[PDB]
Write a protein that binds this ligand. Structure first.
Ligand code: ATP
Ligand code: ATP
Ligand code: ATP
Ligand code: ATP
Ligand code: MG
Ligand code: MG
Ligand code: MG
Ligand code: MG
Lengths: 752, 449, 172
């Protein structure tokens, strides 16, 4: 019901835009049954609606090729109406068109160059001679002939704007030629269709700025005054200023733009004078819309503001929107990154009554955004925008635009050999072959990350699941953890349960916790934020808690996101055991983490993963299911896992075939993964020492070791040691057996 | 302005936003602002000899006004335009709905009773939102692209009780707009066990507003403080969610450490502001999840730290003592570490009620398992009673984890079947006995003895 | 012809001495576009509204001479996080920069470049796409890179025949 405004409902007037085979710039062709339904005779002047407040006039024609549900037009009228292929436009009979007395015509500057003959005589005179072609202001049409075809833009027509060009009517092309960039920018205008995702938000905005203007009679009849204030808030890059541009481009209302800091002035009372001048200019202009970009810049809380000028400006805004004298139907929109920074008196019904959340788009929303951004791009056949939409988990639309731009720039980079920057021009063949393919989009996807996570970007050493030896069950569980809620949510909605979103890795040092986190960061299809434990702590009072809150908010925005704490035992610990820690800053941080993982806020697809050497000291509430639901124990590998670890370390290593890894794994009882990696590194280093001494011998005689042999591994094992002791294993197994006793029974079976 | 008022007397001078030009001259930094405050004080003093000039001013920050203006002789009288009660809200709705095309089925008394913290601008917003919902309902008949409309649409267009109920669902007090947080939809049947706790909470939240005359008769004021303490995962925050969703009262859900700020004196200001907006929204439930973050034992931070936490807890106790019996603000606290709460928080008149949320028992565990599985397709031959008997010391979170892991295994099996059919070409409608057994094989007790 | 706009915002970052201001100087010297230099601090003024007025004047001047490049040296000085900065005249200059870089009216041919030793202290809304499209890490050079730097610096010097810059590069 919210998007009821948006639906077209398939009215008869709308017809699909189609290519016209023979119709010239001033005529259109429609099917005979469709005209019979519309009661239109041949040659009738018919008015065409267009997007962005554009309209076109043409002469209807009876075409058998044209379908009843379609209208055939050339590119000229399509340009005039600002529409693309497959769009639906209105047609209505145009009443009382009067023959023109005089029209002022201006050509496009890029066309006028290279034409020695007079443009009016060569082009306009034969084109318009006995033409009987209706024209409208702002309509760009093309005339063939001469060396180069010269487009003509009719700036002025009389009677304004509907007239029929006739031989008696005076036509002239004298004046400054229209800048090609001006017409291009007119084409490059934002509309409600250029807004992707946020369909309900756009529906609300259209109900609140477009609906009262189109049909005031609704609100005069039902006897209510529509909302007069819009606050757009969301993370940066979600489309707040884009929605403002769309509204400005395609509303008949007067639009006044206020940029936040532009109000400020050094003179006393000059800022308030600027605000009053803006509001008075809007009020003079009947229905008007005032957009205040960056509202939080000039609307801070009066109680928290220190400077008097800022508070006086906030008060001026307060009295302007809702004071003793009421606004004369002036719509006030504003956009802000920080809605909670705004003065609370502004956020009531009289001033900013409706707050619209332009949030992070979902998969379908971001597919729509990708289609909008690539509608003008040249895409190859293998491009698949649905897959790109699936991959980009945290992107907000500015990130999608960045992805498309980087894909196109990669497509251009593929042509560097054929293109020389010293060369003044590029070949036609290079222009034709240049296009964006799926490979470029995949590369851009590899480069792309959400902008909100730029601050939390950490280089991960590119570990793969195969780099980890053993831990097959843990690998499967981590992959399922990250994948099932993302790719298969309807399964959870069918079974009616939310996914678990927490895992704790506890085990001896060197056994593969951080390695599993690296494998997740590289292989899992989710955003990844990596946190060293004590990095969130700050000297200031309340700032460590703010850092925890901020990192959790970043994870929430970028969902599905994996939040990894490499050393959980630092930031999370049992409360009440720290004598100092500031003023209980450590305990307050723990409580903040507790409220973040499980509080009264709704749950998102944020997976918190923690690794700890010593799991006994972590706060018991942190371990509670719903916060780190699963406690995974990463123990010392057994012989099969030791074989797998040794093989995973030596896969790239050129190692002798006669080297026996099974014997090594058998002898290395009690060794961790770091221990076996150390054995392999020692063997590599002994081989390198041997090769260096052989090369030194060759150099001396002038004035070897392709692979790692059994003797190298023998000596490496001779210097090998066991890193984790039996007491450490005893305490880890003690924690594991406490959990096992918590299970309460050896085997659970339902009675038969 | 004052001279023009005197020339045309009797006169009334209305100073809208008085705090814009009347800050405390001591706190004022600018010379022109100070000179203006002094000039306005001088004009107010000279207002005595003025024959018929009366100055009326309005401000929403009365405290920020310079105190010298609030002595006697200048701005002598102060009128408190407060938050309207139920009958006041009904009067405001009658005023704002007199031009509306109200249907017959509407009862503005119900709309007045539902809106608790609304101040009158929120009631106008409710009327506007309801009328816009009414227009939305007819948007199928009339498309926006239509330049003109049928008259039968005008005849059809009117505001019904469904529209007011929709606006009621959408409506939130403007005061609580900065504090609003999305809360999961939880009902009292979503909670299993704690029947006595549910009844006691409903009594504490309902009786002081519905029957204050009873408390006046017996002379005993209702308690305005609750403390939830218990093992983690046992349902304190679940009860808070249920109260937020079901109870007919405003809810302010605030974590502990978000009030704290590095700037000196901002944390106490935040505490004052949250309690003030709790008063403005009464009947309001003020909930502190993890109470021990802001309310911790005094003397611990005395030795180590700046000392702002003690100031915070002092301001909290001041705010709790400030609110009177008549104002209906219920302060609920929850902590899984009761021992590290400051006992001053616990003393009578402040969080007096102490409710312990224990580890659930066998009947409670059956109730918890049934509540978790009410919306899940489960095999008839699954026995929740045996699950409750086998899970002796499990908390509610542990049982929910059992159910979630059973769901995960069922989803894994369904995906396996999908992959099998896809591979062979080129199932699991409900959770069963074996899924629950395999989930139990991983089960653990969150809370130790 | 490909159907996209080129990226228009560049944030160079790295430790001191890597060559961010050197790269800015090279770009200014060897591009055929109106180059505007903004120093971070110099915009600031004690007056209210003067500093963002300076930013508006600079961006408008770059607009009037298009195509243009604006270089904002020491961006962290002029662009701290709004959530962190307390003073109003800092929040306001950051908001002005945000509006100038991507607002309801978008700069057409202006390329805004910046250099910061610390990129995290920059306000996150600036690190967005539409403002600062791509961030380039000018990092510590390798042995070959530092050999190239030594060759660049010693091209003007007179070096004896025994001079071997390869060893000097290997040692530093
Ligand atoms: N929903 C969307 N659909 C299509 N394009 C979008 C959408 N959201 C953003 N964009 C594009 O990405 C960029 C985002 O800039 P925009 O001005 O819309 O963001 P914003 O919400 O105002 O952000 P900021 O808080 O930084 O001001 C623009 O280039 C815009 O074209
Ligand atoms: N299962 C494994 N397969 C392959 N390599 C492993 C494995 N376990 C550990 N390693 C090796 O151990 C080293 C890093 O160990 P890792 O970071 O995983 O330890 P950790 O368990 O997180 O320990 P810590 O508590 O000390 O941080 C790497 O050399 C890695 O190759
Ligand atoms: N009585 C109950 N009925 C149904 N589910 C319950 C019950 N008690 C707990 N749960 C489940 O366990 C979790 C409840 O955790 P909750 O946040 O309520 O605990 P808490 O007592 O506030 O703990 P903490 O102090 O550790 O945050 C939810 O997943 C909920 O589904
Ligand atoms: N890559 C380089 N190649 C050649 N010379 C270099 C290079 N990097 C730095 N230099 C030399 O070092 C000098 C100082 O470097 P520069 O001023 O560019 O540093 P910066 O990274 O901008 O530092 P700052 O943080 O002080 O702004 C340059 O003028 C130049 O002489
Ligand atoms: Mg913006
Ligand atoms: Mg580690
Ligand atoms: Mg809780
Ligand atoms: Mg420099």
């Amino acid at each position: 019901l919210s998007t009821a405004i948006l639906k077209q409902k398939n009215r008869p007037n709308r017809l699909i835009v189609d290519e016209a085979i023979n119709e010239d710039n001033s005529v259109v062709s429609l099917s005979q049954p469709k005209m019979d339904e519309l009661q239109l005779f041949r040659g009738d002047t018919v008015l065409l609606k267009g997007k962005k407040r554009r309209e076109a006039v043409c002469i209807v024609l009876s075409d058998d090729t044209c379908s009843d549900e379609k209208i055939r037009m050339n590119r000229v009228v399509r340009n005039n109406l600002r529409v693309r292929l497959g769009d639906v436009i209105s047609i209505q009979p145009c009443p009382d068109v009067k023959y023109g007395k005089r029209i002022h015509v201006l050509p496009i500057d890029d066309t006028v160059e290279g034409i020695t003959g007079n443009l009016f005589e060569v082009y306009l005179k034969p084109y318009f001679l006995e033409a009987y072609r209706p024209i409208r202001k702002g309509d760009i049409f093309l005339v063939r002939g001469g060396m180069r075809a010269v487009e003509f833009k009719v700036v002025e027509t009389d009677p304004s704007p509907y007239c029929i060009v006739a031989p008696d009517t005076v036509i002239h092309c004298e004046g400054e030629p229209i800048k090609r960039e001006d017409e291009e920018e007119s084409l490059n205008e934002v509309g409600y269709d250029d807004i992707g995702g946020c369909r309900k938000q756009l529906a609300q905005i259209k109900e609140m700025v477009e609906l009262p203007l189109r049909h005031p009679a609704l609100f005069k009849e039902i006897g209510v005054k529509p909302p007069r204030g819009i606050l757009l808030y969301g993370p940066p890059g979600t489309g707040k200023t884009l929605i403002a541009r769309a509204v400005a481009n395609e509303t008949g209302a007067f639009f006044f733009l206020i940029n936040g800091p532009e109000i400020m002035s050094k003179l006393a009372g000059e800022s308030e004078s600027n605000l009053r001048k803006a509001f008075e200019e809007a009020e003079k202009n009947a229905p008007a819309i005032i957009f205040i970009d960056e509202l939080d810049a000039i609307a801070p809380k009066r109680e928290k503001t220190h400077g008097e000028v800022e508070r006086r400006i906030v008060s001026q805004l307060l009295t302007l929107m809702d004071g003793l004298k009421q606004r004369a139907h002036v719509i006030v929109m504003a956009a802000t990154n920080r809605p909670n920074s705004i003065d609370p008196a502004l956020r009531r019904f009289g001033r900013f009554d409706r707050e619209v959340d332009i949030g992070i788009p979902d998969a379908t929303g971001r597919l729509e955004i990708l289609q909008i951004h690539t509608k003008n791009m040249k895409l190859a056949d293998d491009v698949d925008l649905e897959q790109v939409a699936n991959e980009t988990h945290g992107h907000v639309g500015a990130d999608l635009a960045a992805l498309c731009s980087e894909a196109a720039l990669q497509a251009i980079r593929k042509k560097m050999d054929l293109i020389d920057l010293e060369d003044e021009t590029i070949d036609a063949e290079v222009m034709n072959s240049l296009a964006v393919t799926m490979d470029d989009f995949r590369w851009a996807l590899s480069q792309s990350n959400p902008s909100a996570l730029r601050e939390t970007v950490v280089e991960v050493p590119q570990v793969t699941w195969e780099d980890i030896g053993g831990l097959e069950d843990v690998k499967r569980e981590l992959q399922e953890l990250v994948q099932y809620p993302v790719e298969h949510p309807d399964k959870f909605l069918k079974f009616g349960m939310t996914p678990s979103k927490g895992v704790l890795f506890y085990g001896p040092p060197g056994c593969g916790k951080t390695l599993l986190a690296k494998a997740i960061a590289n292989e899992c299809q989710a955003n990844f934020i990596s946190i060293k434990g004590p990095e969130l702590l700050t000297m200031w009072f309340g700032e460590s808690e703010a850092n925890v809150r901020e990192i959790f908010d970043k994870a929430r925005q970028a969902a599905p996101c994996v939040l990894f704490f490499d050393q959980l035992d630092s930031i999370a610990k049992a409360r009440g055991g720290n004598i100092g820690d500031g003023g209980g800053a450590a305990d307050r941080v723990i409580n903040q983490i507790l409220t973040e993982m499980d509080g009264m806020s709704t749950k998102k697809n944020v997976f918190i993963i923690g690794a700890t050497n010593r799991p006994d000291i972590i706060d018991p509430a942190i371990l509670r299911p719903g916060r780190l639901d699963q406690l995974i124990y990463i123990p010392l590998p057994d012989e099969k896992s030791r074989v797998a670890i040794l093989k995973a370390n030596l896969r790239k290593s050129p190692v002798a075939k006669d080297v026996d890894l099974e014997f090594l794994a058998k002898m290395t009882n009690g060794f961790s993964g770091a221990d076996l990696t150390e054995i392999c590194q020692r063997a590599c280093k002994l081989a390198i020492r041997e090769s260096i001494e052989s090369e030194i011998r060759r150099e001396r005689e002038r004035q070897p070791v392709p692979e790692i042999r059994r003797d190298h591994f023998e000596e490496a094992m001779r210097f090998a040691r066991r890193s984790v002791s039996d007491n450490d294993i005893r305490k880890y197994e003690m924690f594991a057996q406490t959990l096992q006793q918590s299970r309460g029974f050896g085997s659970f079976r339902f009675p038969s």
